[PDB]
Design a protein around this nucleic acid. Structure first.
Ligand code: MG
Ligand code: MG
Ligand code: MG
Ligand code: MG
Ligand code: MG
Ligand code: MG
Ligand code: MG
Ligand code: MG
Ligand code: MG
Ligand code: MG
Ligand code: MG
Ligand code: MG
Ligand code: MG
Ligand code: MG
Ligand code: MG
Ligand code: MG
Ligand code: MG
Ligand code: MG
Ligand code: MG
Ligand code: MG
Ligand code: MG
Ligand code: MG
Ligand code: MG
Ligand code: MG
Ligand code: MG
Ligand code: MG
Ligand code: MG
Ligand code: MG
Ligand code: MG
Ligand code: MG
Ligand code: MG
Ligand code: MG
Ligand code: MG
Ligand code: MG
Ligand code: MG
Ligand code: MG
Ligand code: MG
Ligand code: MG
Ligand code: MG
Ligand code: MG
Ligand code: MG
Ligand code: MG
Ligand code: MG
Ligand code: MG
Ligand code: MG
Ligand code: MG
Ligand code: MG
Ligand code: MG
Ligand code: MG
Ligand code: MG
Ligand code: MG
Ligand code: MG
Ligand code: MG
Ligand code: MG
Ligand code: MG
Ligand code: MG
Ligand code: MG
Ligand code: MG
Ligand code: MG
Ligand code: MG
Ligand code: MG
Ligand code: MG
Ligand code: MG
Ligand code: MG
Ligand code: MG
Ligand code: MG
Ligand code: MG
Ligand code: MG
Ligand code: MG
Ligand code: MG
Ligand code: MG
Ligand code: MG
Ligand code: MG
Ligand code: MG
Ligand code: MG
Ligand code: MG
Ligand code: MG
Ligand code: MG
Ligand code: MG
Ligand code: MG
Ligand code: MG
Ligand code: MG
Ligand code: MG
Ligand code: MG
Ligand code: MG
Ligand code: MG
Ligand code: MG
Ligand code: MG
Lengths: 103, 61, 77, 44, 94
RNA sequence: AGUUGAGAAGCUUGCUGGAGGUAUCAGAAGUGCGAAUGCUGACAUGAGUAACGACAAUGGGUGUGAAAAACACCCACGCCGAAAGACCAAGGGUUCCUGCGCAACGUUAAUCGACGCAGGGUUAGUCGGUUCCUAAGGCGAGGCUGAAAAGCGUAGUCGAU
RNA sequence: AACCCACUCCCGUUGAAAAGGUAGGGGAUGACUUGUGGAUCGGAGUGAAAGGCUAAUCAAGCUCGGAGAUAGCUGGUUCUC
RNA sequence: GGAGUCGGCAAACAGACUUUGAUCCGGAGAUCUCUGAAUGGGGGAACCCACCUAGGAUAACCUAGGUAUCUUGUACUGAAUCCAUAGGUGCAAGAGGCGAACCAGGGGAACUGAAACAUCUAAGUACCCUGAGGAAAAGAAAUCAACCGAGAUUCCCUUAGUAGUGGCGAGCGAACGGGGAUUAGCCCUUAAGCUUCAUUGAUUUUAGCGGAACGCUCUGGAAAGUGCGGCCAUAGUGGGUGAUAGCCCCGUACGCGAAAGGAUCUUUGAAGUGAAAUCGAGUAGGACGGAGCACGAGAAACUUUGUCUGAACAUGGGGGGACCAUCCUCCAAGGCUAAAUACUACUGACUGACCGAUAGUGAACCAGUACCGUGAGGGAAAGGCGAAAAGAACCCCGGAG
């Protein structure tokens, strides 16, 4: 099971956008993430005449490594590590600092 | 077609199902050749329905 | 091939040695002929390709004893 | 001028073909030798 | 033929300038057929699947084109083609 | 670039480069190249020199095009014509036709091409195969022979020219 | 004449060509020429016999192994005092 | 298991799949074209032509099964020829081909060395061929010793480059006696053992699960680096994250885990086999010609056999390196036996005073490929943007280059 999942509130640790907060919109292979509102880039595409075109300059979000973010603990307002707690019949994710489940 | 509901049928009823699926697959190839096939995913979906029916039909013994 | 049917003798190899002691490869072949043997039980003649040593064994042991051995080891005649 | 190679596909298959190698043990050794090397062609 | 071979011999109409002109001036149609199909099976399938009366079928085999690329030399699949002649007046539709 | 030793060499720095290096003393060596008509790759000289592949032969006009000695059409000259014209077989395998192209290929340029990209194109009771029959020859149940592998061969069944 | 050959001169020799070309030359119903298929091969085959030919290789083919054969013979052998 | 997915070069455009459990991983099953031992008959491999039985269609077929050869067994049958023999058909079981090495056998060189070369060497090597197994072979004294004794076979270290042998040249080369690894014997008045089924338990293997502990500050595009202070340790020199991380991620030490397959060891039952009947005769010994013994005919014992001969019967027979006598020690001509030993084409984990793209495999890259040759066969070159494609919208020259 993976510690970082889609639609999770995360905070960026290490990088140009270190300190910002957002939501995970996509999880890639090779351990990379797309987090909303961070690591913005502009892509300049030539409008070729073959089957219409796309446009001029488009601004999107570049992926960043999965070890450069952490789950945001919305009880202490800090980055937190996450573990997996004992399972009666199912796994959950808990915060290592406070042992409460991740919601 | 899910295989759970296929094993409730009979050999008499499974052959009609397989025969109908071959009719539909032929029509899907007519559309593909002429060009009026938007539902491109239906091609591989009917292939697995035919294979599924033949699997259950062999298990009838 | 050149194999006796009762003793199993086949060709073997060795050397020819001259006076100056030069060696060349040679073969030693069994002394085997074709011979018809009278089978008293079958009122028949059986023709075998046996060596002269194998004829002496038939004299000592008999033809019924030898023929049973050949059939036992699956040799055809 | 006449050259050494005068092609003929019928004479090619009857000398160097697959069924010609398989007929003798010395042609069967050729095929097993070419399989051990990994040859893509394996026959004329 | 068994009931399952009927749906597997024809692969689709073949459309081109040559095939278009034949379908009007001669009531003759061009199809793509399975490479192991015979003139007898093509005749029965067209009659059964389109409810028409075919009168003559002619077939030819087409070699696949060979295309050279960076990785080497590749070629396309061989296929089979059929010309199908119908009754004097009747139209074939899909 | 400077500087230090008798030498192999050491040291300090300007510029470039952008992530690794190894004082000292020991221990192990794939430990030091100018030559071997040495091996591999790159680049010189000859030199912008020889040559551009049958000495049948070309001259105008128009068009297209960024650009025409070579492309297309027209007028006019030449050459083959028991072929340098047609058609089968072997061999080759898409070189065939059309649209779009000119970097490389074409011993020059190219708008052209047996060149690149993409489509299209081969329709048989009578043509040629296959199917029937055999030649030379091959293989060959049983069989005979042979250290082993195997050789020859009968019934047979392959093999067109 | 076609077809098969190869006597002479010249050209060509980094060739148009690893054996040709232009002029002449011999045989041209036969011990002829030629297509397709087949048989014989490495101390072996075939040879109207030149030690010729056996895939541009022949006083013993090619290929892979013994094999890094042997070389009293040539050549080379790399920093300092 | 627990949220993304529709394989890569290799991207885009589309269509979809699903927390009612998908892609993905493991056990089991179904399907499995044509060629190939190829096996219905032929063939130029991937093609052509068939026959028989059963079922189904009415036209010019479809579906499912069978049809190679040889060996062994069994049933029917039946030539010359009277009986019965060969021979002929029908069934059952088995075999066939491939594989780098190791093993046991059959055949068997030459270059080279001897500073030439014949005996000799190279060498019973290279190579070709035939069988078997996970190992094989060999194995339970007609053995050595020396008047004291040892006690089946296999492998290692010594004796020892010694005794011998040798155109007595070049060379070849033991044994007795010791030190070890392994431990085991049982039958022909029918045994240990082995194989296959059926059951008693244990242990592994084919997937997975949990898995501790960090902050501030400076330079910087980006801290894991600076400076200060902490925490975890059966886990601290692992890989990578935007520069060098025990505490960011995946891991690591350590604990857990299997519907179902494979394997090994363990019980205790059956069946077969061991198996050759009955203690060994064309055998021991001998003559001629060869091989093997370190031993090349030499005083030449011993083993083996191509040709020819040929005993005795425990008051008998074999050996103790010509041969004789005396002593000593064994009982051939019938069998079966684990372990210690040999090898790696193949799978996994770890390691390296190994290489780092002319190196290391011929081969880091779509390599036994391109290419060369009729064929057997030979056989290359060719890695690196950046942390992230953010891979350069837009304007100008130029042939819409
Ligand atoms: Mg000799
Ligand atoms: Mg046709
Ligand atoms: Mg294809
Ligand atoms: Mg410097
Ligand atoms: Mg520097
Ligand atoms: Mg580094
Ligand atoms: Mg050091
Ligand atoms: Mg060196
Ligand atoms: Mg030098
Ligand atoms: Mg140099
Ligand atoms: Mg020098
Ligand atoms: Mg030179
Ligand atoms: Mg040099
Ligand atoms: Mg110049
Ligand atoms: Mg000059
Ligand atoms: Mg000049
Ligand atoms: Mg000139
Ligand atoms: Mg000229
Ligand atoms: Mg010229
Ligand atoms: Mg010219
Ligand atoms: Mg003009
Ligand atoms: Mg001109
Ligand atoms: Mg004229
Ligand atoms: Mg052709
Ligand atoms: Mg060609
Ligand atoms: Mg082409
Ligand atoms: Mg053309
Ligand atoms: Mg054009
Ligand atoms: Mg130009
Ligand atoms: Mg040009
Ligand atoms: Mg073209
Ligand atoms: Mg014949
Ligand atoms: Mg034969
Ligand atoms: Mg035979
Ligand atoms: Mg025939
Ligand atoms: Mg003919
Ligand atoms: Mg001619
Ligand atoms: Mg003249
Ligand atoms: Mg002439
Ligand atoms: Mg003449
Ligand atoms: Mg005359
Ligand atoms: Mg003739
Ligand atoms: Mg021959
Ligand atoms: Mg020779
Ligand atoms: Mg002479
Ligand atoms: Mg050659
Ligand atoms: Mg020649
Ligand atoms: Mg040697
Ligand atoms: Mg050498
Ligand atoms: Mg000299
Ligand atoms: Mg077959
Ligand atoms: Mg066959
Ligand atoms: Mg069969
Ligand atoms: Mg067959
Ligand atoms: Mg076998
Ligand atoms: Mg010699
Ligand atoms: Mg010598
Ligand atoms: Mg010498
Ligand atoms: Mg000499
Ligand atoms: Mg020797
Ligand atoms: Mg031998
Ligand atoms: Mg086995
Ligand atoms: Mg044994
Ligand atoms: Mg012993
Ligand atoms: Mg005693
Ligand atoms: Mg014992
Ligand atoms: Mg885990
Ligand atoms: Mg952890
Ligand atoms: Mg590390
Ligand atoms: Mg860096
Ligand atoms: Mg780390
Ligand atoms: Mg940190
Ligand atoms: Mg005995
Ligand atoms: Mg006896
Ligand atoms: Mg004796
Ligand atoms: Mg003797
Ligand atoms: Mg001797
Ligand atoms: Mg002597
Ligand atoms: Mg004797
Ligand atoms: Mg004796
Ligand atoms: Mg004695
Ligand atoms: Mg003595
Ligand atoms: Mg015994
Ligand atoms: Mg390994
Ligand atoms: Mg480099
Ligand atoms: Mg390399
Ligand atoms: Mg290489
Ligand atoms: Mg070739």
């Amino acid at each position: 099971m993976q510690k970082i999942r889609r639609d999770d509130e995360v905070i960026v640790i290490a990088g140009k956008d270190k300190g910002k907060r957002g939501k995970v919109l996509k999880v890639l292979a090779d351990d990379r993430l797309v987090v909303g509102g961070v690591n913005l880039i502009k892509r300049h595409t030539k409008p070729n005449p073959m089957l219409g075109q796309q446009g001029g300059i488009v601004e999107k979000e570049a992926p960043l490594h999965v070890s450069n973010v952490a789950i945001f603990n919305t009880e202490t307002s800090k980055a937190d590590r996450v573990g997996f707690k004992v399972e009666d019949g199912k796994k959950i994710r808990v915060f290592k600092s406070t042992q409460k489940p991740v919601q | 077609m899910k295989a759970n509901e296929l094993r409730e049928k009979s050999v008499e009823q499974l052959n009609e199902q397989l025969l109908g699926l071959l009719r539909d697959q032929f029509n899907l190839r007519m559309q593909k050749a002429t060009g009026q096939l938007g539902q491109s995913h239906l091609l591989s979906q009917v292939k697995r329905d035919i294979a599924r029916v033949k699997t259950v039909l062999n298990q009838q013994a | 091939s050149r194999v006796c049917q009762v003793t199993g003798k086949g060709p073997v190899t060795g050397n020819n040695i001259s006076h100056a002691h030069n060696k060349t490869r040679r073969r030693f072949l069994p002394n085997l002929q074709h011979h018809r043997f009278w089978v008293e039980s079958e009122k028949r003649f059986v023709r075998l390709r046996v060596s002269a040593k194998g004829m002496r064994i038939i004299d000592k042991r008999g033809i019924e004893a030898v023929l049973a051995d050949l059939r036992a080891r699956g040799e055809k005649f | 001028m006449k050259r050494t190679f005068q092609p003929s596909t019928l004479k090619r298959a009857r000398v160097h073909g697959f069924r010609a190698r398989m007929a003798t043990k010395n042609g069967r050794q050729v095929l097993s030798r070419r399989r051990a090397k990994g040859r893509k062609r394996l026959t004329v | 033929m068994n009931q399952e071979r009927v749906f597997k011999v024809l692969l689709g109409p073949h459309i081109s300038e040559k095939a278009t002109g034949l379908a009007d001036g001669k009531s003759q149609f061009v199809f793509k057929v399975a490479t192991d199909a015979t003139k007898l099976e093509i005749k029965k399938a067209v009659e059964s699947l389109f409810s028409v009366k075919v009168q003559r079928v002619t077939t030819l085999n087409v070699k696949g084109k060979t295309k050279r690329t960076a990785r080497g030399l590749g070629k396309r699949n061989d296929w089979k083609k059929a010309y199908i002649a119908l009754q004097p007046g009747q139209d074939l539709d899909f």
